């Protein structure tokens, strides 16, 4: 609640379980996670008045997904854009100060339509946090790059386990 | 609407641009694709008896995903297992006979309340179509690890464009 910027040295660190500490949040590690730094977070503002984040990852056009998907016709996976803001709000939860590893729990409505090409700059993640409790916290969430609006998801929702081991 | 089994030798090859032809659907390479067979594929029955598809993906402990999602904690991303389900719905539109290149539309909603862990054997995935028409398919799906049920998406859709390069 108290650092409002990540870095992306931050978010390996994090992904190590090294920010959060034994058995809390983590970010995916590389190739999986889709966030260079976290520019701001916070608990209040967003759209609900509950906190929001605004996050970037950098785009390059030797970025792995840009040759498997799809061969001759490059493209940014919409799931991955949609994988980044389940990350954010698993991100957020850590932040907060809750115990517990990450699982995306699912959505609400997701909606792509426009495209990450890879002669793009950047995409930007905006994250509005609607609702917090198990843990878990409920979000809308839309993608951007270079300032034009591309994805959207309504009722993003992420939770915190303990317990991952006796289902 | 022929054939109704593919391979993975037959995936790859559509991942090429190869099996549907220029300019018209191609499956992910690897490592975003998420098939390594579709054991079934027809355009009736599934439960709005518009048509269907059974696929599966095996699971060793060795993919990509499972070592940095997450670090000492490893589980498929359901990002994935949801991708899975529209790299499924834009292979029928391409294995229909319509023109053009897919792009993932987006999800009605999107649950995730069980896991593939690395010891798991088999996923599989059941998508009911539910509607095609843009050329686009909207349908419903299932993913499950050796017999059980452990993410749902309805809603699925996924169009396909003959042109991409002037949004
Ligand atoms: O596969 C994800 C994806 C989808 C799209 C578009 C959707 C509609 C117009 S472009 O851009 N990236
Ligand atoms: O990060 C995605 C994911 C989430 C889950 C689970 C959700 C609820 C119980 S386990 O499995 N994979």
């Given at each position: 609640?108290?650092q409002?910027?990540?870095?992306?040295?931050?978010?390996?660190?994090?992904?190590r379980?090294?920010?959060?500490?034994?058995?809390?949040?983590?970010?995916?590690?590389?190739?999986?996670?889709?966030?260079?730094?976290?520019?701001?977070?916070?608990?209040?503002?967003?759209?609900?008045?509950?906190?929001?984040?605004?996050?970037?990852?950098?785009?390059?056009?030797?970025?792995?997904?840009?040759?498997?998907?799809?061969?001759?016709?490059?493209?940014?996976?919409?799931?991955?854009?949609?994988?980044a803001?389940?990350?954010?709000?698993?991100?957020?939860?850590?932040?907060?100060?809750?115990?517990?590893?990450?699982?995306?729990?699912?959505?609400?409505?997701?909606?792509?339509?426009?495209?990450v090409?890879?002669?793009?700059?950047?995409?930007?993640?905006?994250?509005?946090?609607?609702?917090?409790i198990?843990?878990?916290?409920?979000?809308?969430?839309?993608?951007?790059?270079?300032?034009?609006?591309?994805?959207?998801?309504?009722?993003?929702?992420?939770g915190?386990?303990?317990?991952?081991?006796?289902?």
């Amino acid at each position: 609640t108290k650092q409002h910027a990540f870095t992306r040295e931050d978010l390996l660190r994090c992904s190590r379980g090294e920010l959060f500490g034994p058995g809390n949040a983590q970010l995916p590690a590389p190739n999986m996670l889709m966030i260079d730094r976290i520019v701001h977070i916070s608990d209040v503002g967003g759209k609900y008045g509950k906190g929001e984040l605004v996050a970037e990852l950098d785009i390059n056009p030797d970025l792995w997904f840009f040759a498997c998907h799809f061969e001759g016709d490059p493209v940014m996976p919409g799931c991955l854009g949609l994988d980044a803001m389940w990350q954010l709000v698993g991100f957020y939860l850590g932040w907060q100060g809750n115990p517990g590893r990450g699982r995306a729990l699912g959505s609400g409505e997701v909606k792509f339509f426009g495209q990450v090409l890879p002669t793009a700059k950047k995409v930007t993640y905006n994250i509005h946090i609607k609702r917090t409790i198990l843990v878990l916290a409920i979000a809308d969430g839309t993608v951007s790059v270079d300032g034009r609006e591309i994805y959207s998801a309504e009722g993003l929702r992420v939770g915190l386990f303990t317990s991952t081991d006796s289902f």
